[model samples]
Target: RPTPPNLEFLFSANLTKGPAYIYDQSDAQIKALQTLTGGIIAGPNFDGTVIGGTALSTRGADGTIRADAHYLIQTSDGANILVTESAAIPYVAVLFDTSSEKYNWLNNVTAWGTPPNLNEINFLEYWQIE
Candidate 1:
């Protein structure tokens, strides 16, 4: 029997605050928290990994907040992954890609997060592909 590796809790990141809205004047309604000030990732593959990056948001004319998330992830295993996402609404599973190998599996991973609370912190989740 082929036993697959269990999809474990890799890590959780605490994102910092940045530019709230970018293209506010444009019709696209482009908005975001531009830069990640500081944070940390805790779990198996993320021990000692520095948590810092950028995320963007684009609000549709219809009030849909499409998310463009980016993270410069430094893995504890001597690897770095540049995490990027297209457009994801809050609480929706978002697809992401990594920079290259070492964390190549992340290139085929899906992640999501809850809406930020009053403190403006987002709780993110990630899982391996089935």
Candidate 2:
């Protein structure tokens, strides 16, 4: 196992507040907190290597397949959408192309869960080819 890694939060369409993120867990009644923490979730490959995957909701966005991560962004027009560790809304995942050094960000993410809790953010559970 490659041990767990750190994760970050991306943007969402549900903008109750300004572009600023409101991580509410106190009193468990949707109170805005300063921070929410989680990591990119992934499974090990046959050779004990790390593969990439996507958020639950990122399947058909932008007409391309990607791995889920906070660094994985989708640019539409001029808006850069941040896709991070939360399964409540499936966001785009940035696929790792180790072949290219430009994508080094993909290495630091901590894998999130199948259906992430608002409290716990993460990356994809694993990578698959279908």
Candidate 3:
């Protein structure tokens, strides 16, 4: 048997939803093009603004809405990053990219994320799988 890896705390992306361009298919299916207009990123060793990004989401017959999202961000120290993932509530897989060496570790990370708890604000929390 193989041992399971531990999950480490990562970050919480406090986000605000923007306008959505929704496409409703003839067969009762839906697709939406949404935006992350603005928000903030906070977590271990990181704090920044959500520069915004686009999401192309589709719904299947099983009623699973898969969100294929790519997030753009700029850290307080001025590092640009791209956080991309696909999720159906829970993330299927998450990844990141950055040009700054200061945040280069993000390139080697595969994270898991949880959806928001509908209360004050909507957000997502991404954690590292160590």
Best by TM-score: 3
TM-score for each predicted model, relative to the true structure: 0.62, 0.24, 0.88
**Model 3 collision count:** 0
Q: Among these predicted structures, which one has the highest lDDT?
A: 3
Q: Which is better, 1 or 2, measured by TM-score?
A: 1
lDDT of 1 by residue, 17-118 (tens): 566756564575656567766556665655444466666777776778876666666766766676665555655454545665666776777654444453
User: What C-alpha lDDT do the candidate models reach, one value each?
Assistant: 0.60, 0.31, 0.81
Residue 98 of candidate 2: its Cα lDDT?
33
lDDT of 2 by residue, 1-130 (tens): 7765445442222111122233433332332222223222223321121122232222233343233233333223222223344333333333332322343444444333332443432322333222
RMSD of each: 5.2, 14.6, 2.0
Q: Write the per-residue lDDT of candidate 3 for residues 34-123, one digit (tens) a residue.
A: 888878899886899989888887877677778888888899999999989788744546899997999999899998877666454357
The C-alpha local distance difference test score for the whole of candidate 3 amounts to 0.81
